[PDB]
């Protein structure tokens, strides 16, 4: 989500949950 | 880094994390 | 946060991710 | 038909490419 | 909509064009 | 439109949300 990862640093594991 | 490119960098990161699977908006 | 520079597919995907279930409309202008 | 399923960013970017200067609308339904 | 047509099923170029503005 | 706002200039989250359906 743009709000969270640009109001904080997002991990790899958190980004993988958005993958198809 | 350039905080004006955070959204851009996020989209680039999703491209590399998800590679050829593609991504969607919900986790 | 600060205002963002977004072009091309970065802008389209920003809209995708921000608007979520609502969807969005994009015209390159 | 297209060769594959198109989901998420793959579908958004397909519409982005195909529609070009007309732009498009995307509702995830 | 376009997700049902192109993500759940397989769609055509013509179907994608129906969602151009 | 959103390109002028976010590519020529820089734009806020609120400006992107204006193009949600």
Author numbering:
A (entry chain E): 2 to 21
B (entry chain F): 2 to 28
C (entry chain D), D (entry chain B): 1 to 29
E (entry chain A), F (entry chain C): 1 to 21
Question: Which sentences from the paper describe this structure?
Answer:
In 2021, we reported the development of insulin icodec, a basal insulin analogue with a long half-life that would allow once-weekly dosing (A14E B16H B25H B29Nε-C20 diacid-LγGlu–2xAdo desB30 human insulin). Insulin icodec is a once-weekly insulin analogue that has a long half-life of approximately 7 days, making it suitable for once weekly dosing. The Insulin icodec molecule was developed based on the hypothesis that lowering insulin receptor affinity and introducing a strong albumin-binding moiety would result in a long insulin half-life, provided that non-receptor-mediated clearance is diminished. Upon slow and continuous dissociation from this albumin-bound depot, insulin icodec activates the insulin receptor and elicits its biological function.
Next, we determined insulin icodec’s crystal structure to find out if the stabilising effects of insulin icodec substitutions have a structural explanation. The crystal structure of insulin icodec contains three icodec molecules in T conformation in the asymmetric unit: two that form an insulin dimer (molecules 1 and 2) and one additional insulin molecule 3. Importantly, side chains for the mutated amino acid residues in positions A14, B16 and B25 occupy roughly the same space as the corresponding side chains in human insulin. Lys B29 is pointing into the solvent, and the fatty acid attached to it is disordered and not visible in the electron density, as has been observed previously. Structurally, icodec molecule 3 differs from the human insulin structure in the conformation of both termini of the B-chain. The C-terminus of the B-chain deviates from the dimer-forming β-sheet conformation from residue B25H onwards. The observed conformational differences between molecule 3 and molecules 1 and 2 are a result of the trimeric arrangement in the crystal. When looking at the 3D structure around the disulphide bonds, the A20-B19 environment is affected by the substitutions in the icodec molecule. The side chain of Arg B22 is located directly above the A20-B19 disulphide bond and alteration of its conformation and dynamics will change the solvent accessibility of this disulphide bond. In insulin icodec, B25H is forming a hydrogen bond with the side chain of Asn A21.
